[PDB]
Design a protein around this ligand. Sequence first.
Ligand SMILES: CC(C)(C)n1nc(-c2ccc3ccccc3c2)c2c(N)ncnc21
Length: 462
Amino acid sequence: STAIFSDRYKGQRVLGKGSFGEVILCKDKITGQECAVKVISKRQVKQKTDKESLLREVQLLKQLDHPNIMKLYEFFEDKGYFYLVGEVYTGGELFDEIISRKRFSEVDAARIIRQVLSGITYMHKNKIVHRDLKPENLLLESKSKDANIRIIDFGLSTHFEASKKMKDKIGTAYYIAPEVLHGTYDEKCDVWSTGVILYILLSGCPPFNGANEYDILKKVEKGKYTFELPQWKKVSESAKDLIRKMLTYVPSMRISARDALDHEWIQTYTKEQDVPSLDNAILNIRQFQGTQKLAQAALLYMGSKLTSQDETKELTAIFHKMDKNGDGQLDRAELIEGYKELMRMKGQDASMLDASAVEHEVDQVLDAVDFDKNGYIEYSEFVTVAMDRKTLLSRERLERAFRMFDSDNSGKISSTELATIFGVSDVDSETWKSVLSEVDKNNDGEVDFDEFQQMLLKLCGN
Ligand SMILES: CC(C)(C)n1nc(-c2ccc3ccccc3c2)c2c(N)ncnc21
């Protein structure tokens, strides 16, 4: 008898979105153990390996243990999804902790990189490669100041094909090793990516940058970088020597993770116990992160509007089919089956796969619109409220990211800032400039939140 994910775990809430799918906070129905479950949709994510080799990898991943690697507990598969059940970490993404700090030094950078290299070293010893190591794969175990870094997604890229969509690709290009682009790669690609992260920790700027994804990739492929920014004079020679060794082009000549742990810089800056703060780096990192998160948020918002266009008409068609008399009236149980159908096929809400969760969601919608749950209900009104709820939630989510980005509380994003944001979002320059011209009818060279939102709607066919 095949084990079923929903027989064991109940979803608590959505934690967020990472490579290959959504991540839900779930709870064991017997033991109360909380876990983070990555839900991978088989429709949206292609497997690179056969069923056999995935199961073997899962079996190995479950037996591995290292304080800087996410612990994997369980693996399930049904007709539409894979469910990877791992340990929940509450400290958030590393870069989001770093920007909140008042000070940041080479000591703090070295302690971070030692952890990352320690985890990588351990995984490489077990023949597992990450390939997609980047700052958002570095979580802090908890919100404690001394919290360990946990690397997420080790081994997934070997089995699952990366998305080609920009909403899924934000940030990837800065960190990818050149050899990954060309097709022949091995565990050394993780050292390159860690070298890129280190470069960013110490200067707050990517070593390989550009105005759009392809220009970033062209720089990565050339493999050349400099330490000629003003940030770099504050920085020890040994740190730059380690970075050089990690950003060595030919992988056979590149330093291994284990040898990087013995490097002078790691040895000097992580030992027992006066190092100056890297203030310009923190400032740069603040700006870098803010830009990445707004571009991410903008893409997410556009995707949510498109998903709504899709799901709003489908849900209406599902209920119309169920409505035998054509009176427009369905009961709660029918609303639940109709909503269930919608969720199974679309797979845009991993939290709505369990039937109990859909029952709960319908009751939340019904409770919102003052409809009695025990009688017959006008479905067209339920559809409106259920979709309007989602639409409101999406807009609120974009706004929070707009406010986050607007660090001086100006209420505006300048035209220069839009260029950077849309460049990161890989929205064509002539296209957004054109949309900006339709919205900014007075050449102010800046947009407030509503205007930014209007641009995004125009940039997804509205
Ligand atoms: C940041 C956020 C919401 C995207 N996230 N993501 C995870 C996470 C990442 C990769 C996984 C791979 C296999 C199984 C579970 C996984 C969970 C994760 C986590 N464990 N704990 C906290 N947040 C997490």
